[PDB]
Amino acid sequence: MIHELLLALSGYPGSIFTWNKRSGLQVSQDFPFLHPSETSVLNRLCRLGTDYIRFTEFIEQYTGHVQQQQGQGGLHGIYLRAFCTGLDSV
Amino acid sequence: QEALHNCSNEHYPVLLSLLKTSCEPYTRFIHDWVYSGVFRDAYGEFMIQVKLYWTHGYVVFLKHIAHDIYVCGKTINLLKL
Amino acid sequence: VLMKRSITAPLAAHISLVNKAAVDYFFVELHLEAH
Amino acid sequence: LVHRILPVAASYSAVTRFIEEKSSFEYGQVNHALAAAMRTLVKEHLILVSQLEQLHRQGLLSLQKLWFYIQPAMRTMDILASLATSVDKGECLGGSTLSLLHDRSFSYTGDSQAQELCLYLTKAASAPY
């Protein structure tokens, strides 16, 4: 629960925080070791690691992936690659 | 061209170190036939090569001086003989 | 900007010297000017 | 890598046999001096390989270093073995094998590593003529 949370937030989902691509990271939410008081906190915590995984996936997808030739601003472009470059350091 | 393609990314220094040594042998080819009249080629990576002595054949690089090396080397090569 | 012109500069200054001395060699020695 | 070092050995056996057979006193005057001057370059090779011997006894050699050390003598022995094969192959004699040595000395003019070899050979081989 301790390391597994850091694993899930870091970009390494376990089988505690079950990664879906239609609901991001979501905690199991059906077991007797999470209670309604804890439930809101867990849901609040899942979203940040979801954002982190999507950010890293975007950066690896769009920097250093072509040998340059194509005209596109959503899939390609030096400025998009520069966005990934700034985004990782932030 | 791969240099200017990634002239700003993190693969700019790595490819710079690659290009710095991949142009090393060809410049050494040039510095023989221009200054000593000794024609150096290795595998056919040098396009220029050498009856009244002007029936010899011909076969990024700036094309303004490509044709000039062909006479600049043959002159020095004839003064050797 | 990456360019190989910076290394063209210590070579191109000598090509013209070779070719102009070659042109002089015809006239003052083999008398192309007389022909 | 031992197989890569063997061409200098075949360009050493073929070299030494030619130096005995063409020193005999029934060929031309130029061929005797030609072989007797190739003897000098073989003696130079011997003097090089023995300093390599003292370096090996001090534990300061390896096979990639050995292949690197014998390359300048490899090129000389290559040119010499090719010339030896050519001179025996055509039943060559007289002064027509002083044109061959004149041609070899004329071929290199700017290298000065290989030019000096063939020029020295034409120097010693033209003395009886």
Curated annotation (Swiss-Prot), chain A:
It is found in: Cytoplasm, Cytoskeleton, Microtubule organizing center, Centrosome. Ubiquitously expressed. It comes from the Eukaryota. Belongs to the TUBGCP family. Component of the gamma-tubulin ring complex (gTuRC) consisting of TUBGCP2, TUBGCP3, TUBGCP4, TUBGCP5 and TUBGCP6 and gamma-tubulin TUBG1 or TUBG2. TUBGCP2, TUBGCP3, TUBGCP4, TUBGCP5 and TUBGCP6 assemble in a 5:5:2:1:1 stoichiometry; each is associated with a gamma-tubulin, thereby arranging 14 gamma-tubulins in a helical manner. Gamma-tubulin at the first position is blocked by TUBGCP3 at the last position, allowing 13 protafilaments to grow into a microtubule. Component of the gamma-tubulin ring complex (gTuRC) which mediates microtubule nucleation. The gTuRC regulates the minus-end nucleation of alpha-beta tubulin heterodimers that grow into microtubule protafilaments, a critical step in centrosome duplication and spindle formation. This is Gamma-tubulin complex component 4.
Swiss-Prot record, chain B:
It is found in: Cytoplasm, Cytoskeleton, Microtubule organizing center, Centrosome. This is Gamma-tubulin complex component 6. It comes from the Eukaryota. Belongs to the TUBGCP family. Component of the gamma-tubulin ring complex (gTuRC) consisting of TUBGCP2, TUBGCP3, TUBGCP4, TUBGCP5 and TUBGCP6 and gamma-tubulin TUBG1 or TUBG2. TUBGCP2, TUBGCP3, TUBGCP4, TUBGCP5 and TUBGCP6 assemble in a 5:5:2:1:1 stoichiometry; each is associated with a gamma-tubulin, thereby arranging 14 gamma-tubulins in a helical manner. Gamma-tubulin at the first position is blocked by TUBGCP3 at the last position, allowing 13 protafilaments to grow into a microtubule. Component of the gamma-tubulin ring complex (gTuRC) which mediates microtubule nucleation. The gTuRC regulates the minus-end nucleation of alpha-beta tubulin heterodimers that grow into microtubule protafilaments, a critical step in centrosome duplication and spindle formation. It comes from Homo sapiens. The chain holds residues 507 to 607 of 1819 of the full protein. Signal peptide: none annotated.
Curated annotation (Swiss-Prot), chain C:
It comes from the Eukaryota. It is found in: Cytoplasm, Cytoskeleton, Microtubule organizing center, Centrosome. Transmembrane segments: none annotated. Belongs to the TUBGCP family. Component of the gamma-tubulin ring complex (gTuRC) consisting of TUBGCP2, TUBGCP3, TUBGCP4, TUBGCP5 and TUBGCP6 and gamma-tubulin TUBG1 or TUBG2. TUBGCP2, TUBGCP3, TUBGCP4, TUBGCP5 and TUBGCP6 assemble in a 5:5:2:1:1 stoichiometry; each is associated with a gamma-tubulin, thereby arranging 14 gamma-tubulins in a helical manner. Gamma-tubulin at the first position is blocked by TUBGCP3 at the last position, allowing 13 protafilaments to grow into a microtubule. Component of the gamma-tubulin ring complex (gTuRC) which mediates microtubule nucleation. The gTuRC regulates the minus-end nucleation of alpha-beta tubulin heterodimers that grow into microtubule protafilaments, a critical step in centrosome duplication and spindle formation. This is Gamma-tubulin complex component 6.
UniProtKB/Swiss-Prot annotation, chain D:
It is found in: Cytoplasm, Cytoskeleton, Microtubule organizing center, Centrosome. Ubiquitously expressed. Signal peptide: none annotated. It comes from the Eukaryota. It is linked to Cortical dysplasia, complex, with other brain malformations 15: An autosomal recessive disorder characterized by global developmental delay, variably impaired intellectual development, speech delay, facial dysmorphism, microcephaly, and varying degrees of cortical malformations including pachygyria, thin corpus callosum and subcortical band heterotopia. Most patients have generalized seizures. Component of the gamma-tubulin ring complex (gTuRC) consisting of TUBGCP2, TUBGCP3, TUBGCP4, TUBGCP5 and TUBGCP6 and gamma-tubulin TUBG1 or TUBG2. TUBGCP2, TUBGCP3, TUBGCP4, TUBGCP5 and TUBGCP6 assemble in a 5:5:2:1:1 stoichiometry; each is associated with a gamma-tubulin, thereby arranging 14 gamma-tubulins in a helical manner. Gamma-tubulin at the first position is blocked by TUBGCP3 at the last position, allowing 13 protafilaments to grow into a microtubule. Belongs to the TUBGCP family. This is Gamma-tubulin complex component 2. It comes from Homo sapiens. The lineage of its organism: Eukaryota, Metazoa, Chordata, Craniata, Vertebrata. The gene is TUBGCP2. The chain holds residues 259 to 387 of 902 of the full protein.
